[PDB]
A paper describes a structure:
In order to facilitate the purification costs, we searched the ESTHER database for a thermophilic [name], and identified the [name] 2 from [name] (TtEst2) that has been previously structurally characterized, and presents an open active site that could ease protein engineering for further optimizations. The recombinant protein was purified, biochemically characterized, and its kinetic behavior towards different OPNA studied, before performing a structural analysis of its complexes formed when soaked in a racemic solution of the OPNA. Biophysical characterizations demonstrated that TtEst2 is a monomer in solution, with some polydispersity and good thermostability at physiological pH. We determined the bimolecular inhibition rate constants for five representative OPNA, namely tabun, sarin, cyclosarin, VX, and paraoxon, to estimate if this enzyme could scavenge them at a fast pace.
Numbering used by the authors: 6 to 172, 181 to 281
Write the structure that this text describes.
């Protein structure tokens, strides 16, 4: 991956101006697109530990889902190696992206109620923050337009950020807030949007146990929260180019059937 990314064929829209930085959405429209459609949308957040990464990471997935009838985009967001930000600022950026898409749903040809948030690792964390973590919103935006996504597709996300529980200072200094405030696990509750999670059993960056604990506690609250374990796979397994795209093709396959499952996508 490179940054700045190369995104051929994508339409470029600035969704947020902050610190004189113009944060961009790379939008991939389907074939039979008109401003009057009400298609589902998916917004991808790249990974890279809230410090690096590139919107090009999920460009392959955008092209796939746009070919399947969605308005697919990859969001840029501020990161530590480029901008003076902490994790809490990254969350505000991800929320701005969802709010912007909903605010512009009419011109995007999008159903404001079928907006999916998605991401890998740190960007999987952000996507989950847009469905279940409160506040951390850009203070000058219209809070009467909801920043909450309607579904989430998570690729080995980080879901537990605070040790407030059973079983360090470097982390608290890159968070920009109390650890619980940026931790999806400590905001599990009933009535949350549906979601599907792809995680590796041998993940040594984000332990699989932290995700299975999240998913179980999410089911006892009545939410749709499906784990798809990938046996022996490690952090990053899903990415286009890993092995020979067996995980990439299967994650796309199980994500497609999940969007059909909740009604955001039409059968083939």
């Amino acid at each position: 991956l490179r940054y700045p990314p190369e995104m051929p064929g994508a339409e470029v829209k600035v969704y947020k101006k902050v610190d004189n930085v113009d944060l961009k959405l790379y939008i991939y429209k389907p074939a039979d697109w008109k401003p009057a459609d009400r298609r589902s949308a998916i917004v991808f957040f790249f990974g890279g530990g809230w410090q690096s990464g590139s919107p090009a990471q999920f460009r392959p997935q955008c092209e796939y889902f746009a070919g399947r009838g969605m308005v697919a985009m990859a969001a840029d967001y501020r990161v530590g190696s480029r901008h003076n930000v902490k994790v809490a600022d990254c969350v505000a950026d991800a929320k701005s992206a969802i709010r912007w898409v909903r605010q512009h749903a009419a011109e995007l040809g999008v159903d404001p109620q079928k907006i999916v948030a998605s991401g890998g690792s740190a960007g999987g964390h952000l996507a989950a923050c847009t469905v279940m973590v409160p506040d951390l919103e850009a203070p000058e935006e219209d809070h009467t337009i909801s920043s909450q996504a309607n579904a989430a597709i998570l690729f080995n996300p980080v879901l537990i950020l605070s040790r407030e529980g059973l079983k360090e200072e470097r982390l608290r200094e890159r968070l920009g807030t109390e650890p619980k405030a940026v931790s999806p696990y400590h905001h599990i509750r009933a009535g949350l949007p549906p979601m599907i999670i792809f995680h590796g059993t041998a993940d040594n960056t984000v332990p699989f146990e932290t995700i299975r604990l999240f998913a179980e506690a999410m089911k006892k609250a009545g939410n749709r929260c499906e784990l798809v374990p990938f046996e022996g796979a490690a952090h990053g397994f899903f990415n286009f180019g890993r092995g020979d795209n067996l995980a990439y093709q299967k994650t796309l396959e199980l994500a497609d059937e999940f969007l059909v499952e909740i009604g955001f996508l039409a059968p083939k």
